Nucleic acid binder design. Structure first.
Lengths: 116, 226, 304, 161, 125
RNA sequence: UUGACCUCAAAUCAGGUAGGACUACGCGCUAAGCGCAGGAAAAGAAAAUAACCAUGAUUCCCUCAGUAACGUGAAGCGGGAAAAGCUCAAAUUUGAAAUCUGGCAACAUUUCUUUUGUUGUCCGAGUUGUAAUUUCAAGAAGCUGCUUUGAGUGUAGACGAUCGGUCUAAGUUCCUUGGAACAGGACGUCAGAGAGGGUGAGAACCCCGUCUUUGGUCGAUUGGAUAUGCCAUAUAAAGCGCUUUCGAAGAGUCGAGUUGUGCAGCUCUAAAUGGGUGGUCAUCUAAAGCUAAAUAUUGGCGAGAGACCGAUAGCGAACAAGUAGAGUGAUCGAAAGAUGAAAAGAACUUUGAAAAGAGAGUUAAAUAGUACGUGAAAUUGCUGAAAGCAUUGGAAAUCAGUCUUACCUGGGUGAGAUCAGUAGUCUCUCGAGACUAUGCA
RNA sequence: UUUCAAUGGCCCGUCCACGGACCAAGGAGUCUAGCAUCUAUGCGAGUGUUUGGGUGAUGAAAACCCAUCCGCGA
RNA sequence: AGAGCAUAGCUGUUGGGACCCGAAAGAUGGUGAACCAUCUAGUAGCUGGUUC
RNA sequence: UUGAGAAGCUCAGACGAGUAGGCAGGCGUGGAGGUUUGUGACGAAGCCUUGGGCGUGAGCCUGGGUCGAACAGCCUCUAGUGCAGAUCUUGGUGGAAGUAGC
RNA sequence: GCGAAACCACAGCCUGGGGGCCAGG
RNA sequence: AAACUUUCAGCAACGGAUCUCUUGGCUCUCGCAUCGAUGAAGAACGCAGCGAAAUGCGAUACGUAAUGUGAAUUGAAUCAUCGAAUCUUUGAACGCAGCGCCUUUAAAGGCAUGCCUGUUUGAGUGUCAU
């Protein structure tokens, strides 16, 4: 059995079109969600900064985004991750603040019943 | 490859070591060797004797490198493009290509490779505002962006010296695409043009110079008597 | 239509067998009713004549009627060949010549042509003399017809003759040129003048050629030598044969008298390619007749 | 090769040929209207987003970007209030205003009262006043639904408008 | 050069599609140019042939001949024209067929559908 | 004597559903056998790693790494693709079973008279528990004041998707060869089209197409949005402030002993700051459940390609091909492509019982006649000639090529040009070419 | 070319034996991964774009570009 | 007071069917009362062959 | 003196068996890119030929006959590339032999 | 009248010396 | 001498090599997701064209309706589209393997098993109340 890679450029194209399809659907908003900055978990890589999964509940509380409305504006929430140091908290609280600085959220239609 | 279910000496048997799809079809070249060959192929395109040696009919081209105005980028009709090549006298190469269209010799024309012909001028543009469609039907003519020069189109067959018709903006961006030997390329990261083993490639100029002919011992005969 | 080879061969075999059966049955029943009633036997035999190219020859009005025509005889009594056919009876004097620098193969055929014609000369073509210059030179030397045997690559492929001094010039391409050795049951010719017979030259262009060939031969054959030279035009192919003939009994012949032919040679064929009015100049000759190849593809269309 | 595939070659019935092979075909933008009216159907979504003044990714990019032209603290990061950001292009400006104007149109989030609610709060008000909501809550004869003082305040505040 | 990956440049597929084309597709494949006058008055370059059309043979051994199309032999992509025949050995006049592109239409058999086709295909009756 | 419930039956009662086939890719039991799926399947929101500044469902790719471990052979981390989270059981709605299938009757609705619902009513299910609320990331119950809100139904237009129809540039001019012009030459044309195929030989302009088309137009089916109309059971439902109040968490399982291949069998069989797994600490929170995408795909419905094969090749099969044929059967399984541009497939006459033959005739070609393109060798017949491996030559037969017309010199006669004690034009860079006059020293 | 003359001339492959009736066609060191040396090439205390991302309007499976890693070396 | 890394070619060698053909078995699943289909290109110190 | 394809030209001298084995240069075939203003219905390819020529050779060029639609040189790329044999595979055809025999 | 098949490097005069080589018959 | 035997050449056979072709195979890529008790896959039997050792179709038997092109085949079509019809005997095959049965007027509609939900009718020295 040999796995042959003749579809390496046909995969590349298909993934671009899936990105293009994803935009066509939600084109005013980014094709990817925002991610936190986390430090890799070892003595070898702990000096790097890499993308995490989602923001902690302490980070969202401090920024001002409740865990319910966080996902609706494309802010992932990782309940598993936590903040053992203040550096990670303030690094990612600022990240949410900057993202909200550039956010234009378009109003939705709200039910307004005639009576009380 | 052949089918995996399809001795080798027996009729209606199977062939020896049948072909497999997992042969090595593609080959890697160091990206610096790829860039060196593109630089060498472009530098050769500016030598008129290498263009003639490759088969191009450039005997009445006004100047090599042949660089035209940026009005050519906004050509709309093939008539305007066929007209331009005629005033700059690049159309004789197009006559060479158009007249050279033959049927292919072999089984290769049973496999969608029906016709063969020579290669005409390579128009290198900077912006596409109509130039590609105005030129793409003239036989043998190829158009390419100056940001994406192809070695397949710059040395067809591995033979150096393609006839390239640059536009003014394409020619202006050549120094940003390739850089200098001392200064870097703007459109390639950390890239410098290759350095040469010799300085002046005219070796007969070195040999027959006053520097070297003033200290050499007096030469014996050429072909000597018996 | 059947793209299976075997089936279409079996389908043809069944079709062929049925076609042969019912054509035989039709033939058998027709035979039975014809032997019973001859009034339809020769009735069929008188209309169902097999067709042939000569019977299906395309119509040309230039074919002259067998009855004499005054207008043709008015034009033929004062033309170039008239001095041969008039009361003057000028004895022909032929000049035979090959192309420049010919081989022994050309002469081994020119000798046979010399045997066919008494009192005919042969000057080997030498130097820078031209056919339009030999004609003038032979005209002042008493010759009346010059034949030039053209060869290249050791084969005599053409024969141009000019009627002296300004008579029409004809260009022929010889073919199937056989010498007396190559002919089975041949003979040795004598010095007797041959007798010429010409057949099947119906078109008016045919008479121009027939008079040209007639003018070569002496008008009084020596019958006691019983040598006959035949020029026959079939489907525009002119065949030249020479024979020895001796009359004897023949049960198949109509009157009981028939002749036995012994071939003398040479044996060859010609095709008339060009006729010019005047001395033969290849570049500036006034073309009387040019043979268009694309028009000769009709096997039923002849100019001779 | 297969018998099902020879079934179709040896039959005169045409194939269900569907001609939907469009390569280099990009997806057309439904979704927004302002984005649709400013979308170059040739350019990539990265180029189209960048030209429009939007962000395709709020994260990094995992490759080199296209270069066409030779271009020449806890308390401070927690209590800071960033004052939005400028809109680089006119399309982003157009998106910003329409969203603000659309908020103005649908800006009456405040609710009117109903007949039941008005008589409920009014009857409690006439007996207890308009300031002692704690004693209002502790009443059970009038506050039958047993609303707390916070729901009574909203009823009182809402009744005026 | 074709740019569409919906159309095939494979010779095997083009040849299969031509010869295995159905009779409705063969109706378009047998098309003849109109004469200059019809071309310059109906504003249509070429139409599919029909029975009872007056044509002139333009190419071949029967060049210059005219006549009405007696029938269209769509199976062999051949046209049949009045008096453009060949005599057999027995004396029968077996018709000879010509390709529809090798003739030219000099007088159209104008049905109502052609006129609707004419106006639809940029024409003016 | 009656009734209620329970349990077990019957019905050709009403409404359903299961089977069999395919199986490339999936998941199981045990390559094969057996079982079961889908457009993917499986897996999946930690009884997961780690020992760090910690990470954060799953899957896939790269790397780790041929490393550790015991020749086998990973995994944590790291880089990437795609990203999405949730539902119950266990707590009284207890101021109200708030829940649901079905029948019947209306009404609406449709990819659809075929579909799918709404409302009303009646029976049944259900308190041995159907809803709401809650899922540990929590959460309930109070209290508080800030912000929030449609499982409704139309119309309108725009943007999208699918399906069918429709819209489109230019030579068949002249000459030669040919059976045929699609060839050669001359002269034109179109080009967002000079892909490919067809047509009697190499066709951008004869024809279908191709390009435009990453599109105008016309039907029809629908996506998610937008604008707006009418309804809206809100006495409602949420998010986040606070707490002198509470906070349930899955057992013949985990675990232990022993056998067979973690799993399974058998014996025994738990706990509640417990239990699992790592280095007292850390970290998870099993024994219940669902879940797109990124991934796979020798099958299905279709496409588009190719430095592939070219009729003993390529699939066994270019054609009749799983066919003919073989075998009781399971199974096994071939050989076989090409006349010509057009059948114009050979009229007719004649011989023969026939098969066919010979005259003929069609074709450019019959050295294309279906035993048909080309038609090799082995091989066979006839005729002709000679005779009874190498070296070298003879005889016989055959063959190759082989030159004369030019060089110089003299004169006569006219010719002109690159000549003129000569005049102009065009293109290049004074004079260099090309010319048109005029003269002939 | 055929034949004659004078001279020489013992059947080929294979390992005595084994294969050989003749002719045509087919018929056997292949592809791929690892390693080692040698040569060429590019760069050089560095080096390697092609897991993937960007991009490619003429074919878009190409060519072009490159973030973060990672290998081997030091 | 570092010479390596990459790519390509030749050569060697190791593993894959591994230069080609040729070896007595056996296993899984069936058919008929041994046979059949896969595994299977089973096992090679060997035989015969291996192209200008 | 023109004789630099410096990878060219030119001078001299010696040498020549060859299995295993090593090294080098060449000839050929199918397909690929480039090229020859390449060849071709006024005849491509193939095949036949006591026609001619070149090369030590592998081989190549050509005349004639046959034929009827495509083909080749040169520079690189590539490979299912070269047969006398394997009691090789397939097909065709022999002597045995008009024998044995019915 | 019908009609194989196996097999076949090549072929078929002896003597002697080393079924074709050498010298003779 | 001749036959015979051999060799060579020519012509005629034989054979089907070569060359050229090619609606075929093989390989890679891309797009999509749709069998069956509402009778599948497969098998048999018919129908008319025919060459069937092929194909289409089902007693409405190359198919009928509707739509489209618009005038054949060798409101046409051996056409295309295709939403309506129809679709023999079998086969998971389902009344039992001709034989039967139930209902309605020889014809028509039905008659398999397991399970789910419900409906109706029965049984219990099953329990309980009056």
């Amino acid at each position: 059995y040999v796995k042959t890679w003749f579809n390496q450029p046909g995969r590349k194209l298909r993934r671009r079109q899936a990105r293009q399809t994803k935009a066509a659907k939600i084109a005013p908003r980014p094709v990817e969600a925002i991610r936190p900055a986390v430090k890799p978990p070892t003595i070898r890589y702990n000096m790097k900064v890499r993308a995490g999964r989602g923001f902690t509940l302490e980070e969202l509380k401090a920024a001002g985004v409740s865990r319910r409305v966080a996902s609706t504006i494309g802010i992932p929430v990782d309940h598993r991750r936590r903040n053992r140091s203040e550096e990670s908290l303030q690094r990612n609280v600022e990240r949410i603040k900057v993202y909200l600085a550039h956010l234009i959220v378009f109003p939705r239609k709200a039910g307004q019943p005639k009576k009380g | 490859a052949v089918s995996e279910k399809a001795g080798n000496m027996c009729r209606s048997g199977r062939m020896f070591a049948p072909t497999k799809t997992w042969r090595k079809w593609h080959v890697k070249v160091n990206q610096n060797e790829k860039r060196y060959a593109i630089a060498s192929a472009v530098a050769a395109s500016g030598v008129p004797s290498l263009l003639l040696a490759r088969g191009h009919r450039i005997e009445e081209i006004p100047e090599v490198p042949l660089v035209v105005d940026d009005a050519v980028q906004s050509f709309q009709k093939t008539k305007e493009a066929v007209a331009l090549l005629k005033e700059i006298k690049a159309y004789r190469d197009v006559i060479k290509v158009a007249n050279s269209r033959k049927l292919r010799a072999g089984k290769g024309k049973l496999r969608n490779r029906r016709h063969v012909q020579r290669r005409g001028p390579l128009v290198v543009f900077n912006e596409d505002t109509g130039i590609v469609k105005a030129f793409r039907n003239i036989p043998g003519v190829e158009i390419v962006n100056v940001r994406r020069l192809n070695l397949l189109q710059l040395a067809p067959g591995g033979h150096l010296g393609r006839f390239v018709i640059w536009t003014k903006s394409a020619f202006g961006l050549l120094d940003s695409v390739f850089g200098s030997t001392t200064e870097v390329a703007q459109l390639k990261k950390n890239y410098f043009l290759p350095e040469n083993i010799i300085s002046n490639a005219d070796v007969t100029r070195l040999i027959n110079s006053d520097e070297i002919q003033s200290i050499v011992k007096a030469a014996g005969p050429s072909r000597v008597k018996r | 239509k059947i793209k299976n080879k075997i089936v279409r061969q079996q389908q043809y075999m069944k079709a062929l067998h049925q076609k042969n059966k019912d054509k035989l049955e039709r033939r058998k029943e027709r035979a039975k009713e014809e032997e019973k009633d001859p009034e339809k036997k020769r009735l069929r035999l008188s209309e169902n004549i097999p067709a042939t190219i000569e019977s299906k020859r395309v119509y040309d009005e230039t074919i002259i009627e067998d009855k004499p025509d005054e207008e043709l005889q008015a034009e033929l009594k004062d033309d170039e060949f008239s001095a041969y056919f008039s009361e003057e009876r000028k004895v022909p004097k032929l000049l035979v010549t090959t192309s420049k620098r010919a081989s022994r193969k050309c002469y081994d055929f020119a000798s046979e042509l010399l045997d066919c014609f008494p009192n005919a000369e042969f000057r080997k073509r030498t130097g820078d003399i031209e056919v339009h210059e030999i004609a003038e030179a032979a005209a002042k030397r008493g010759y009346t017809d010059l034949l030039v045997l053209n060869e290249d690559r050791k084969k005599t492929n053409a024969l141009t003759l000019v009627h002296l001094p300004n008579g029409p010039s004809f260009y022929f391409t010889l073919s199937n040129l056989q010498t007396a050795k190559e002919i089975s049951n041949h003979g040795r010719s004598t010095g007797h003048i041959p007798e010429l017979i010409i057949n099947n030259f119906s078109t008016r262009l045919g008479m121009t050629v027939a008079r040209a060939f007639q003018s070569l031969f002496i008008q009084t054959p020596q019958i006691q030598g019983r040598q006959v030279v035949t020029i026959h035009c079939q489907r525009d192919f002119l065949f030249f044969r020479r024979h020895r003939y001796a009359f004897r009994e023949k049960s198949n012949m109509p009157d009981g008298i028939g002749t036995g032919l012994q071939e003398l040679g040479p044996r060859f064929t010609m095709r008339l390619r060009m006729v010019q009015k005047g001395v033969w100049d290849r570049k500036e000759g006034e073309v009387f007749f040019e043979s268009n190849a694309g028009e000769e593809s009709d096997r039923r269309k002849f100019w001779l | 090769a297969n018998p099902r595939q020879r079934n179709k070659q040896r039959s005169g019935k045409p194939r269900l040929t569907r001609r939907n092979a469009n390569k280099k075909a990009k997806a057309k933008i439904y979704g927004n209207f302002v984005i649709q009216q400013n979308w170059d159907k040739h350019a990539t979504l990265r180029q189209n987003y960048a030209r429009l003044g939007l962000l395709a990714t709020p994260n990094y990019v995992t490759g080199g970007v296209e270069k066409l032209y030779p271009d020449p603290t806890l308390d401070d990061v927690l209590d800071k209030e960033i004052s939005i950001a400028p809109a680089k292009t006119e399309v982003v400006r157009q998106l910003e205003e329409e969203a603000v104007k659309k908020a103005a149109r649908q800006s009456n989030k405040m609710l009117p009262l109903s007949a039941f609610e008005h008589a409920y709060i009014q009857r409690l008000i006439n007996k207890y006043g308009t300031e002692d909501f704690e004693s209002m809550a502790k009443d059970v004869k009038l506050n039958s639904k047993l609303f707390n003082g916070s729901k009574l305040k909203n009823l009182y505040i809402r009744m005026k408008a | 050069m074709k740019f569409s990956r919906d159309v095939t440049s494979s010779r095997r597929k083009q040849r299969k599609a031509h010869f295995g084309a159905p009779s409705s597709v063969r109706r378009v494949l047998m098309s003849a140019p109109l004469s200059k006058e019809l071309r310059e008055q109906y504003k249509i370059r070429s139409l599919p042939v029909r029975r009872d059309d007056q044509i002139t043979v333009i190419r071949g051994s029967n060049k210059g001949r005219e006549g009405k199309i007696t029938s269209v032999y769509r199976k062999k992509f051949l046209l049949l024209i009045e008096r453009v025949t060949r005599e057999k050995a027995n004396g029968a006049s077996a018709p000879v067929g010509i390709d529809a592109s090798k003739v030219v239409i000099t007088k159209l058999h104008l049905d109502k559908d052609r006129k609707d086709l004419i106006v639809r295909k940029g024409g003016k009756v």
